[PDB]
Design a protein around this ligand. Structure first.
Ligand code: BO2
Ligand code: BO2
Ligand code: BO2
Ligand code: BO2
Ligand code: CL
Ligand code: CL
Ligand code: MG
Ligand code: MG
Lengths: 196, 204, 212, 195, 222, 233, 226, 195, 196
């Protein structure tokens, strides 16, 4: 799995590959790892598919109930609910989740939640088995307050390399753009991103 | 299972004014079963004394081995081996079985016949030499012996006083160990006389 | 540990050693392995020091409550079964106990029950319990009779512990003697093995193997 | 195998050894003699792992008999015991060690003294007035500590040995089917056919 | 896998006199080959003229002392400020220890004080609660080094009177407080020399009818 | 029972004449991967206490929330919350120490080593340690993990016993701490150059320094080292 | 164990503590850890004590024979090469962790050796259970162009750090200085900061205190004449 | 414990059970009765893990005695055996199962027929003419297969039982110190004091 | 460990960090992992220090003896000797070696030899625990026929990132330049390469 989230001038963009593996067999080559817990709060999932789905489902429920009572939740609030599940059930879970969302007050925000259940607020975040191969690239190439087009290129190039080197990553590169304008889905096929 | 504590036993050695002392218990057992109360652990080759604790078959084997080697030494050298030289011979002999060692805890004691200087030394099972000025300890109650010697010992003790110190060190250490006791022997060693004394102790 | 108890004409003789060990290290030579449950009941201790102490002390509280409720001395049978039923609840948890419950009542006569942390409860005339039990059995079985004097019976018990104290590395220290009769138990002193061995050797002409 | 005993009295050495051979759940034989004559005045009883016991005993027997023929002379019990100890002390650091414990009872014709040696499979030798291997000593040593006297006759030794076997038959779980008793003295070796 | 036990080293020593009692212990605290503290008190005044120390795993040691101090407080509340006698304190500690029989306090406990006749008293416990009154007891890491020395120099074991040769024993004459403190200091100096976990400092608590006094002595810091 | 995942390394500290100093680097490691470079591991409580934490970071964040909640709870129905009945270092420590030992006693520990540094009401210096086992101890100098092996030796040369505390100034003490942090960067494979330092003085109060770096490093001698023995070029 | 090595202006110095330990017990309080490979090549050893002695003696012996064969003073790199190849062959099972130093016709040298056979070069080095305490001192006080006096001070201070802070080290500080164009001076017990205090009591017993069963003269002399 | 046997003849059921109790290396007792009377015409012998055996037997005894008092009526051997089987079948899936094997010998006063049931610790019940638990059956079933006729008298049953015990004493390694024999018939339960 | 070798127009350059670790303790912070088996054939060492030294020592011996008989060996020949040792003793070794050298006929060449004992000729090679974090960076930034100055910058930047992310890597960046001109040693200290 290769997943990342990057803040930029107009908001935040989530990115992911589409490969699910049972050992060396690709059980699904067109998986959607970018999942929605609220209108403009999404997450990237890595680790156990069952665990991260079960967690994401529970978070979506908690935020739906929050909204009904207290109105739209902050991205910090969403990350806290993810944490509470991951930390208190650390013994029985294998989940590495990146939470990303867009407020109008706070703009684009990114929270990463590794195995332990700790929370880390960052300008951008990378995770999954394939992320190891792009620490060097992402650190050298990330700037704050990038444009939409620049951020899409940064994620596209980054995940392209992660896919190239990691056997657990592959297929299409899915992306989800979160801004004031709304929610846009992007897809990039192998013929496009391999020649980069 | 642990080879060094199947049979049990202890040895201790000390220095005094123009004299040395070496002592040992008499027990041989098979774990909890006491088998023999006449198993002496101190041997001598000329004027050099060697005490050996640990696995009893190795105690016997090494005694026979060092008798063998010191006898050939004497025939070729035309003199008795000295404590300093013998110490080196024990270290050599043990290290040649580095990766298949004799499970023992040897202790050398004696007076150099030329210089008159009192000498003691200890070893681990694989050859390392501990050459102490004051005292050496060995066996299943080595911890107890360390405590007794460290508190009771003082330098430059006369032969008859040194006897009391070493005897009390052994006896009280043995009485706090399940695998030691069943009798005890003490050797007092001067430049040209050696007295051997069997001690009366509790037989449990 | 070596503990024994046997029935005879003059009641029951109980004899125990005093040693406690942690591995090869002698932790204590002055351990009280006989528990005075009441003026009529004694309990012996072997195995885990804490398990035996705690539950045999607890045991006296249950008996005291029985005679408060029933206005009558508890039987040795009921006494031993309270202990055996208790340890059976803990079976598997890792309790380590080998005990004799000894006493005398009008209805039962002199009675000894062997009680065990496996749950085993056995009535019997002679029992030896502990790491040195085999050594004590040798002396007892060859010299036991029903027609023994209180003086001779006391010595046989003392001598049997001495035998085991000598050979068993995990037994020793001293010998505690008790004599249980119609009118209760009577303590018969602490006997240091360091002095008792040489005394017995000289007078009895035994232990010719050892030099003295 | 199971139980082997030994006792040295005034003028002889007496060895007692069980008759049973148990392989698993059944007692295949109840009349087995767990001993070999090494020389006219030296007897060795043995107990340990199946096969190893006899193989070792006969191997020693052959070596001592070879010495006897070569020198036209009987080795002392002390000399034979030392040879046996060395073979076991050599054995313990082998690829597959001999798993055998022995008692060596002999009469030294030079010193006119009976001698009993106890040696285990490690090569641990001790001279004793009375000895045993395995669980036998746990029952018997207490009795021998009490009764033994160095100056006992052979008849007194046999009575003390009967008291030991009676105790074993009372307190040991395994039925060892009694013992074969043999006496070693100045006149040689003989078997007590009624015991 | 998680291991709930640890070993903080240290060593303690209790000696009972004719009309007094002492409880000593070194001030060093350790894990593996590192020193945590050169002065971490280990022997505590628990009130009612009772001193206590629980040597081994310090977390269990502190917990136990804390719970016993608590027990003394509630003993006063529940029984009209009655003084908790040393024998009663001992039995109470047995129940605290055995209460965790199947997940034990990994400590060697010793308490000291005076009995109800005013005579000196020392009690000793194993981790699971077995206990016994004693005239002399060392506990902890260097217990194996110190006890034999105390058998010899406090109870005159293996000592006889000159001229008689093994026939007459050395009489068991009583030891003063000055004489006992000498034996305690020598015991710890000797233990420090040969045990790596013993050193830094020695703290002794003396108990008399007048109350509880303290004395501190330096030990080797290597 | 668990295993620690995202981890924090050494916390070091000492006493001086008028107060206490404590320090810890800003790294959150994921095994050998130096994953998170902006992690604050010194957490102040009021204006008189600083709690330094090492080990599992998720458990640190849980402890951080407990302390945050402790301040809130102490203010409840407490008119003297910012005065006589404010949280003392000794109170904060004992609370943590209770929790740590309780959690180890349920076989579900908080996988941390903690050092509580502060100054009491009467001006007395407070410095005490507690870890996942509930083990506690105090000493003029305290350190966790690698700091225990490397920092303590250096810090003990300044304050070796109790009587050395009044003779140690704040300038001398901070110098020793900063040096120790440099040594740890040379020699700990799970440390970073960036760190935080906190001083709690009885006169000047709490000073919290962020974004400090290890400086004045000796590396020039490396150029002369060639091969592993015989090589000359 | 704490052992260190420090280069200086005109040579090299090594140092060591004097504590040997079996588990938590001290076997020897004044142990000698500085070994002589040749007159001007000395090494300090940590780990298994019999191994550090044995491997030093063997290499020291072969070095001597080599020196006689070649008619040249032995080199440190020769001792280094012979030690590493020996240790590598035994795949770490010979537990010797050595700091090898010396002066020879090439110059002054300082190396370290580990049990598996890996060697390292440096101006300052430390090995053993107290190496972390020692290295902390070395990293704080070491500079280029140290004098002889400064290097001895730095080396002994690094050992002291081990003595005091590490439980696997203690007692005394041994030093050996190897300067270019000079005899190597071996300073046994250079520092003695751990003398035991006078005991409170004397434990000399009255004569006749111990019970005896038998006495006898032991014949240590040979078979006599006449 | 060790050996327990059972045989059903024309008009009675005979149970034989060893007297030895061995804990480890020593035989603590040689006169132990490994049986409990459940009702006047129903006897249960038992063998298994220490403690569990007696605890289970007395627990069953108490329950059947409670039934007898409540209904003023003795349950059939078939009914008692079914109750026992269920308790063991319940037990086997518990936190700590009863490790006990039993033989239930009873005389049904309604049908005027002797009945022998064999039940193991799993709750495996079978009605048999003759049965055994542990290693006992390995020696004894071959003899019973040959000699047993279903019309034997009680005296003939005891002789066939003596032949079984003799074989056990010959071929089993463990000394079980003989057996206590009990007969169950129309008149109730009695013990054969000389065997 | 972070090690790499890169061919360029004028020859080849070897690069390495200087960290040796026993667990988390840095046993040596100024280690020289660039070692010489012949005048213009060097290697980078990763894995066991003892194994890679023992191997390198044996190779130096074999090439010294080759030279005495047959003259200067090719870089391919040197790689083959390394392979023969690593392959035939694969069970008992833990060594990851990069062989680099300069011929006049063949110019700059690089052979990498991973754990198995296989040989791979490449334009450039990366190895060691820290190499995982720079697969993405190196793949995107490597060009053939670079200049000396460009190649030094490529290695300096690459290893800088590997050091930044890998705990097992650190200290100074050592480099060794191999051209027709000769053999040049370079060193780069933390203050220089960290600010990149
Ligand atoms: B990714 O590779 O981490 C991926 C993300 C997931 C949310 C779709 N995980 C998986 O593919 C996991 C295996 C795995 C690989 C690498 C690291 C951790 C876990 N697969 C599954 O959970 C899975 C596989 N087959 C069927 C069902 N679930
Ligand atoms: B005895 O050996 O069974 C003895 C009786 C006990 C009541 C003092 N037990 C022990 O000595 C046991 C160890 C042991 C030895 C042999 C067999 C079984 C058990 N020792 C302890 O229980 C103990 C208690 N506190 C401190 C040290 N040892
Ligand atoms: B030091 O602590 O590394 C020291 C150096 C040695 C050369 C004197 N090592 C020891 O003291 C070793 C530690 C050790 C203990 C157990 C196994 C292996 C190593 N001790 C001994 O070599 C030793 C222990 N007892 C007797 C003799 N030698
Ligand atoms: B590097 O980290 O791989 C490095 C290269 C080596 C040639 C100096 N290896 C080491 O530092 C190894 C440990 C190791 C770390 C990471 C991967 C593989 C191996 N260290 C040692 O071999 C070593 C450590 N301490 C003393 C001696 N040798
Ligand atoms: Cl999915
Ligand atoms: Cl290297
Ligand atoms: Mg792929
Ligand atoms: Mg069945």
């Amino acid at each position: 799995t290769s997943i990342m989230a990057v803040t930029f001038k107009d908001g935040v963009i989530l990115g992911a590959d589409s490969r699910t593996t049972t050992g060396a067999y690709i059980a699904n080559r067109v998986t959607d790892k970018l999942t929605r817990v609220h209108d403009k709060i999404w997450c990237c999932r890595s680790g156990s598919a069952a665990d991260t789905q079960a967690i994401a489902d529970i978070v979506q429920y908690h935020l739906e109930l929050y909204t009904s009572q207290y109105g739209t939740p902050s991205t910090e609030t969403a990350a806290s609910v993810f944490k509470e599940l991951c930390y208190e059930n650390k013994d029985n879970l294998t989940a590495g989740i990146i939470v990303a969302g867009y407020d109008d007050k706070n703009k684009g925000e990114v929270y990463t939640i590794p195995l332990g259940g700790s929370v880390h607020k960052l300008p951008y975040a990378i995770a999954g088995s394939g992320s190891t191969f792009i620490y060097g690239y992402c650190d050298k190439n990330f700037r704050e307050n990038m444009s939409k087009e620049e951020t899409v290129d940064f994620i596209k190039h980054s995940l392209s390399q992660a896919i190239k080197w990691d056997g657990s990553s592959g297929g299409v590169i899915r992306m989800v753009v979160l801004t004031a304008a709304g929610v846009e889905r992007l897809i990039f096929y192998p013929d496009e991103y391999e020649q980069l | 299972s642990d080879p060094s504590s199947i049979n049990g036993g202890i040895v201790v050695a000390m220095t005094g004014k123009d004299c040395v002392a070496i002592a040992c218990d008499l027990r041989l057992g098979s774990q909890s079963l006491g088998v023999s109360n006449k198993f002496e652990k101190i041997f001598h080759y000329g004027h050099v004394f060697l005490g050996i604790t640990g696995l009893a078959t190795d105690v016997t084997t090494l005694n026979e081995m060092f008798r063998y080697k010191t006898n050939l030494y004497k025939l070729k050298e035309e003199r008795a081996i000295e404590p300093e030289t013998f110490t080196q011979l024990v270290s050599s002999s043990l290290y040649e079985r580095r990766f298949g060692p004799y499970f023992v805890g040897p202790v050398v004691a004696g007076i150099n016949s030329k210089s008159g200087k009192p000498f003691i030394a200890g070893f681990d099972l694989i050859g390392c030499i501990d050459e102490a000025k004051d005292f050496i300890v060995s066996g299943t109650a080595s911890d107890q012996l360390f405590g007794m010697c460290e508190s009771l010992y003082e330098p430059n003790l006369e032969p008859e006083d040194l006897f009391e110190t070493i005897s009390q060190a052994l006896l009280n250490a043995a009485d706090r160990d399940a695998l030691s006791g069943w009798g005890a022997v003490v050797y007092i060693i001067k430049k040209d006389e050696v007295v051997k004394r069997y001690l009366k102790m509790r037989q449990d | 540990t070596t503990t024994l108890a046997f029935r005879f004409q003059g009641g029951i003789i109980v004899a125990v050693d005093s040693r406690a060990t942690a591995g090869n290290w002698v932790a204590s030579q002055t351990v009280k392995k006989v528990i005075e449950i009441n003026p009529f009941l004694l309990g012996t201790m072997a195995g885990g020091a804490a398990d035996c102490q705690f539950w045999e002390t607890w045991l006296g509280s249950q008996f005291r409550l029985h005679e408060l409720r029933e206005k009558e001395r508890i039987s040795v049978a009921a006494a031993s079964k309270i202990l055996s039923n208790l340890v059976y609840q803990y079976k598997g948890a890792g309790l380590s106990m080998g005990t004799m419950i000894c006493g005398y009542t009008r209805k039962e006569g002199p009675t000894i029950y062997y009680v065990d942390s496996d749950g085993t409860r056995l009535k019997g005339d002679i029992f030896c319990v502990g790491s040195g039990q085999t050594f004590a059995y040798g002396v007892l079985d060859s010299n036991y009779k029903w027609d023994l004097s209180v003086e001779d019976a006391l010595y046989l018990g003392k001598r049997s512990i001495l035998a085991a104290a000598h050979r068993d590395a995990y037994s020793g220290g001293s010998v505690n003697l008790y004599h249980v009769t119609e009118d209760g138990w009577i303590y018969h002193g602490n006997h240091d093995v360091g002095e008792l061995f040489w005394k017995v050797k000289e007078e009895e002409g035994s232990f010719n193997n050892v030099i003295g | 195998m199971d139980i082997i005993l030994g006792i040295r009295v005034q003028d002889s050495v007496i060895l007692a050894s069980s008759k049973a051979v148990t392989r698993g759940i059944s007692v295949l034989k109840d009349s087995d003699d767990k001993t070999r004559q090494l020389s006219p005045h030296t007897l060795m009883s043995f107990a340990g792992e199946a096969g190893d016991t006899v193989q070792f005993a006969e191997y020693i027997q052959a070596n001592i008999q070879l010495y006897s023929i070569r020198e036209d002379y009987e080795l002392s019990p002390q000399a034979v015991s030392s040879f046996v100890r060395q073979e076991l002390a050599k054995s313990i650091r082998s690829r597959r060690p001999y798993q055998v414990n022995v008692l060596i009872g002999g009469y030294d014709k030079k010193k006119n003294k009976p001698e009993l040696y106890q040696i285990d499979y490690l090569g641990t030798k001790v001279e004793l007035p009375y000895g045993a291997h395995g669980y036998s000593g746990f029952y018997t040593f207490s009795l021998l500590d009490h009764h033994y006297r160095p100056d006992m006759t052979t008849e007194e030794g046999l009575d003390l040995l009967k008291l030991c076997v009676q105790e074993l038959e009372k307190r040991m779980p395994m039925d060892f089917k009694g013992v074969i008793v043999k006496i070693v003295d100045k006149d040689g070796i003989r078997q007590v056919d009624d015991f | 896998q998680f291991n709930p036990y640890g070993d903080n080293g240290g060593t303690i020593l209790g000696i009972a006199g004719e009309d007094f009692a002492v409880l000593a212990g070194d001030t060093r605290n350790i894990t593996d080959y590192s020193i945590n503290s050169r002065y971490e008190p280990k022997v505590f005044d628990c009130g009612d003229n009772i001193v206590m120390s629980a040597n081994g795993f310090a977390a269990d040691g502190d917990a136990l002392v804390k719970r016993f101090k608590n027990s003394v407080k509630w003993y006063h509340f529940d029984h009209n400020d009655k003084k908790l006698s040393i024998n009663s304190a001992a039995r109470n500690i047995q129940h605290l220890l055995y209460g965790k029989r199947f997940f034990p306090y990994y400590v060697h406990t010793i308490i000291a004080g005076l009995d109800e006749d005013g005579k000196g008293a020392v009690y000793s416990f194993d981790p699971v609660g077995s206990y016994e009154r004693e005239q002399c007891r060392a506990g902890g890491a260097a217990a194996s080094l110190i006890m034999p020395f105390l058998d010899n120099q406090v109870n005159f074991k293996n000592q006889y009177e000159p001229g008689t040769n093994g026939k007459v024993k050395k009489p068991l004459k009583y030891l003063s407080v000055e004489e006992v403190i000498k034996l305690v200091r020598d015991s710890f100096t000797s233990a420090t020399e040969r045990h790596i976990q013993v050193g830094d400092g020695l703290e002794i608590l003396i108990v008399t009818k007048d109350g509880v006094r303290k004395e501190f002595y330096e030990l080797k810091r290597d | 029972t668990q295993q620690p995942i995202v981890t924090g390394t050494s916390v070091i500290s000492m006493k001086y004449d008028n107060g206490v100093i404590i320090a810890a680097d800003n790294l959150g490691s994921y095994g050998s991967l130096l994953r998170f470079n902006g992690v604050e591991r010194l957490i102040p409580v009021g204006d008189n206490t600083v709690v330094g934490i090492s080990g599992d970071i998720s458990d640190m964040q849980h402890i951080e929330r407990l302390l945050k909640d402790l301040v809130t709870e102490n203010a409840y129905d407490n008119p003297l919350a910012d005065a006589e009945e404010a949280l003392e270092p000794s109170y904060i420590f004992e609370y943590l120490a209770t929790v740590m030992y309780q959690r180890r006693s349920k076989m579900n520990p908080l996988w941390n080593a903690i050092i509580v540094a502060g100054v009491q009401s009467n001006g007395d210096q407070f410095l005490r340690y507690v870890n996942l086992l509930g083990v506690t101890y105090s000493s003029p100098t305290l350190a966790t993990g690698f700091g225990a092996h490397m920092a303590n030796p250096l810090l003990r040369k300044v304050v070796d016993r109790e009587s050395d505390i009044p003779k140690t100034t704040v300038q001398v003490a901070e110098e020793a701490i900063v040096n120790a942090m440099r040594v740890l960067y040379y020699r700990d494979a799970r440390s970073s150059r960036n760190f935080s330092l906190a001083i709690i003085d009885k006169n000047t109060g709490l000073t919290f320094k962020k974004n400090l770096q290890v400086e004045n490093m000796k590396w020039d001698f490396a150029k002369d080292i060639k091969g592993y023995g015989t090589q000359k070029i | 164990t704490t052992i260190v090595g420090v280069k200086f202006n005109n040579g090299v110095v090594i140092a060591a503590d004097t504590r040997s330990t079996q588990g938590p017990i001290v076997a020897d309080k004044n142990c000698a850890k500085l070994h002589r490979i040749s007159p001007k090549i000395w090494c300090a050893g940590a780990g298994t004590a019999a191994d550090t002695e044995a491997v030093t003696q063997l290499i020291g012996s072969n070095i001597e024979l080599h020196s006689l064969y070649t008619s040249r003073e032995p080199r440190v790199v020769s001792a280094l090469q012979m030690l590493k190849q020996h240790l590598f062959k035994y795949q770490g099972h010979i537990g010797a962790y050595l700091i090898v130093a010396g002066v020879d016709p090439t110059g002054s040298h300082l190396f370290s050796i580990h049990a598996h056979g890996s060697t390292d070069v440096g101006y300052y080095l430390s090995l053993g259970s107290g190496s972390l305490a020692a290295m902390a001192v070395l990293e704080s006080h070491w500079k280029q162009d140290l004098t002889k006096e400064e290097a001895i001070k730095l080396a002994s201070d690094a050992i002291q750090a081990g003595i005091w802070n590490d439980l696997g080290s203690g007692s005394n500080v041994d030093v050996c200085v190897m300067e270019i164009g000079k005899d190597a001076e071996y300073l046994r017990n250079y520092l003695t900061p751990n003398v035991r205090e006078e005991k409170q009591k004397s434990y000399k017993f009255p004569r006749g205190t111990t019970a005896v069963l038998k006495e006898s003269i032991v014949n240590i002399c040979d078979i006599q004449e006449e």
